[PDB]
Enzyme design. Structure first.
Site, PDB file in Angstrom:
ATOM      1  N   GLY A   2     -19.672  10.649  19.207  1.00  0.00           N
ATOM      2  CA  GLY A   2     -19.208   9.306  19.499  1.00  0.00           C
ATOM      3  C   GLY A   2     -17.900   8.984  18.808  1.00  0.00           C
ATOM      4  CG  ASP A  49     -19.778   2.818   9.545  1.00  0.00           C
ATOM      5  OD1 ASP A  49     -19.716   3.987   9.106  1.00  0.00           O
ATOM      6  OD2 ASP A  49     -19.479   2.517  10.717  1.00  0.00           O
TER       7      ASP A  49
HETATM    8  C1  LIG Z   1     -21.159   1.360  14.140  1.00  0.00           C
HETATM    9  N1  LIG Z   1     -21.053   2.792  13.743  1.00  0.00           N
HETATM   10  C2  LIG Z   1     -21.886   3.666  14.619  1.00  0.00           C
HETATM   11  C3  LIG Z   1     -21.959   5.077  14.048  1.00  0.00           C
HETATM   12  N2  LIG Z   1     -20.785   5.357  13.216  1.00  0.00           N
HETATM   13  C4  LIG Z   1     -20.710   6.552  12.547  1.00  0.00           C
HETATM   14  C5  LIG Z   1     -21.737   7.492  12.608  1.00  0.00           C
HETATM   15  C6  LIG Z   1     -21.588   8.690  11.910  1.00  0.00           C
HETATM   16  C7  LIG Z   1     -22.690   9.692  11.966  1.00  0.00           C
HETATM   17  C8  LIG Z   1     -23.314  10.148  10.808  1.00  0.00           C
HETATM   18  C9  LIG Z   1     -24.350  11.054  10.912  1.00  0.00           C
HETATM   19  N3  LIG Z   1     -24.804  11.532  12.075  1.00  0.00           N
HETATM   20  C10 LIG Z   1     -24.201  11.090  13.184  1.00  0.00           C
HETATM   21  C11 LIG Z   1     -23.157  10.186  13.180  1.00  0.00           C
HETATM   22  C12 LIG Z   1     -20.388   8.813  11.210  1.00  0.00           C
HETATM   23 CL1  LIG Z   1     -20.043  10.250  10.298  1.00  0.00          CL
HETATM   24  N4  LIG Z   1     -19.442   7.901  11.175  1.00  0.00           N
HETATM   25  N5  LIG Z   1     -19.598   6.755  11.850  1.00  0.00           N
HETATM   26  C13 LIG Z   1     -19.571   4.779  13.797  1.00  0.00           C
HETATM   27  C14 LIG Z   1     -19.634   3.258  13.754  1.00  0.00           C
END
Ligand SMILES: CN1CCN(c2cc(-c3ccncc3)c(Cl)nn2)CC1
Ligand SMILES: Fc1ccc(-c2n[nH]cc2-c2ccncc2)cc1
Ligand code: NA
EC number: 2.7.11.24
Length: 336
Positions: free
Chosen positions: A28, A165
């Site tokens: 994502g 976050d």
């Molecule tokens: C609102 N937030 C939704 C998710 N966010 C995320 C999710 C991850 C993540 C961590 C571990 N496994 C999968 C994805 C990371 Cl690394 N950064 N932002 C981005 C912004």
């Protein structure tokens, strides 16, 4: 000392990661950056690799990049996402312009599981207990999340939860909606109450369309502020609004959340208080009778002291960039 990197293009962005991370597949993307799922050959775990988008393009961006790295390096808690690795393909500070963050891969967030299944009271207990457990750790380091919401709560198939976050307005405390500049850590507790109410009912508690409509929905349930809370509002323009509306009484939470666990209703009442001084804290909520099956005082630890003095500093681009560089090399991986 330095490993070997391999270059590849995923989506419309580039990725240069060490050889230990293979099978990079996007998960994502957004304004924060691009996240990829990978397999770590050194540990055998599935990891999430996030490439920051334009980390040093402006003062706000450079300070934000430094803030996120300092934050992720300090969080060492089972219910808070932490740093498995931090790398850059640059060999020197001059070519330093890309930052990559690596963490444990989480398969879903609370938003992907709330509407897919109306959670039972036992699952709500475990999920909310994990949030409050991670919130007690975060708050113990003088850190406020400020943006707690289902998409910021990562969960795996094992029901294990982690905070990330550390519409958005649906979970924002009303003191932030009124632009109070002296809000405390209890703004996160208000978000937990909105999240916990959503898991119990399957509906967004306050799905406001704007900052104005958001407050009317909140005041419809908790009632208009009393004289004790009104004495704490210094903004005359704020009082020109609240004292002008039609006064709403505080509703009976037992009637609004009918059929729910009475212990769950009682906790929501202590979480969704208008006055932030009377809101229950994370540590107090862990000792609530609602989490009797999970509460363990000897297994709810606090954080080491966190140096936030950089937040009040006015530095240049290369100064924030150099400070971020230092935090990359000084990183120590966690034990296997
Ligand atoms: C609102 N937030 C939704 C998710 N966010 C995320 C999710 C991850 C993540 C961590 C571990 N496994 C999968 C994805 C990371 Cl690394 N950064 N932002 C981005 C912004
Ligand atoms: F309508 C409301 C909603 C929230 C508050 C509030 N709760 N805690 C702190 C405040 C607050 C809001 C604005 N200015 C000062 C204090 C005050 C009035
Ligand atoms: Na990460």
């Amino acid at each position: 000392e330095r490993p070997t990197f391999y270059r590849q293009e995923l989506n419309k962005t580039i990725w240069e990661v060490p050889e230990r991370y293979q099978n990079l597949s996007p998960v994502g993307s957004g304004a924060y950056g691009s996240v990829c799922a990978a397999f770590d050959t050194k540990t055998g775990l599935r990891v999430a690799v996030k490439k920051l988008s334009r980390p040093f393009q402006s003062i706000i961006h450079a300070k934000r990049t430094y803030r996120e790295l300092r934050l992720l390096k300090h969080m060492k808690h089972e219910n808070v996402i932490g740093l498995l690795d931090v790398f850059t393909p640059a060999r020197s500070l001059e070519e330093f312009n890309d930052v990559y963050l690596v963490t444990h891969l989480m398969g879903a967030d609370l938003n992907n599981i709330v509407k897919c299944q109306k959670l039972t009271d036992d699952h709500v207990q475990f999920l909310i207990y994990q949030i409050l457990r991670g919130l007690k750790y975060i708050h113990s380091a003088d850190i406020i999340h400020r943006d707690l919401k289902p998409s910021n709560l990562a969960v795996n198939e094992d029901c294990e939860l982690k905070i990330l976050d550390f519409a958005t307005r649906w979970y924002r405390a009303p003191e932030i909606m009124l632009n109070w500049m002296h809000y405390n850590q209890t703004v996160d507790i208000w978000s937990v109450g909105c999240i916990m109410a959503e898991l119990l009912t399957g509906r967004t508690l306050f799905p406001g369309t704007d900052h104005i409509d958001q407050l009317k929905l909140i005041l419809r349930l908790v009632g208009t502020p009393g004289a004790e809370l009104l004495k704490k509002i210094s903004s005359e323009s704020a009082r020109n609004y609240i004292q002008s509306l039609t006064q709403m009484p505080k509703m009976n939470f037992a009637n609004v959340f009918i059929g729910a666990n009475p212990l769950a209703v009682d906790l929501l009442e202590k979480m969704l208080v208008l006055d932030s001084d009377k809101r229950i804290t994370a540590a107090q909520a862990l000792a609530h009778a609602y989490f009797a099956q999970y509460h363990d005082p000897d297994d709810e630890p606090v954080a080491d002291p966190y140096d936030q003095s950089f937040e009040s500093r006015d530095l240049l681009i290369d100064e924030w960039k150099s400070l971020t560089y230092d935090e990359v090399i000084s990183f120590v991986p966690p034990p296997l």
